[PDB]
Amino acid sequence: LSEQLKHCNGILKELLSKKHAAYAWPFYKPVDASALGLHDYHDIIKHPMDLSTVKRKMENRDYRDAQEFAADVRLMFSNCYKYNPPDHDVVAMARKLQDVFEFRYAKMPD
């Protein structure tokens, strides 16, 4: 409800919008490790994060400030960079969506 959290909510809506769906879709929901046969995922990634979890936390007023919101969005990208080989298509899509995030996050009102 704070001005900075309104900015964060706007960014979240954009990341979930059809505008970015071509590269955002792998980040919409938690990685289903069992479904994908990624039996090492939860051994390598101790704190999973995804946009549906960020959305639930925003709706529940879990985030007290913009910094806490940004930490979860960057955790989501960091998990992807940690688990996947750097030449995987999902890493290319992470880099593109993080570019969208970082450039708009940088326009935070003071």
Ligand X SMILES: CNC(=O)CN(CC(c1ccccc1)c1ccccc1)C(=O)c1cc(C)c(=O)n(C)c1
Residue ranges in contact with ligand X by CB under 6 A: 26-27, 31-32, 36, 38, 80, 83-84, 89-90, 93
Nearer to ligand X, 63 or 79 (CB): 79
CB-based contacts of 110, cutoff 8 Å, min separation 6: none
16 half-sphere exposure, CB direction, 13 A CA radius: 16
Closest by CA position to 75, among listed 98, 109, 99: 98
> Among all chains, which residue has been given the structure tokens 């009102």?
109
Nearer to ligand X, 8 or 49 (CB): 49
The least distance separating ligand X from the CB of residue 10, rounded to whole angstroms, comes to 23
Question: CA 101 to CA 17: how far, in whole Å?
Answer: 13
The least distance separating ligand X from the CB of residue 93, rounded to whole angstroms, comes to 6
The least distance separating ligand X from the CB of residue 90, rounded to whole angstroms, comes to 4
Question: CA 41 to CA 83: how far, in whole Å?
Answer: 7
Nearer to ligand X, 13 or 42 (CB): 42
Nearer to ligand X, 66 or 94 (CB): 94
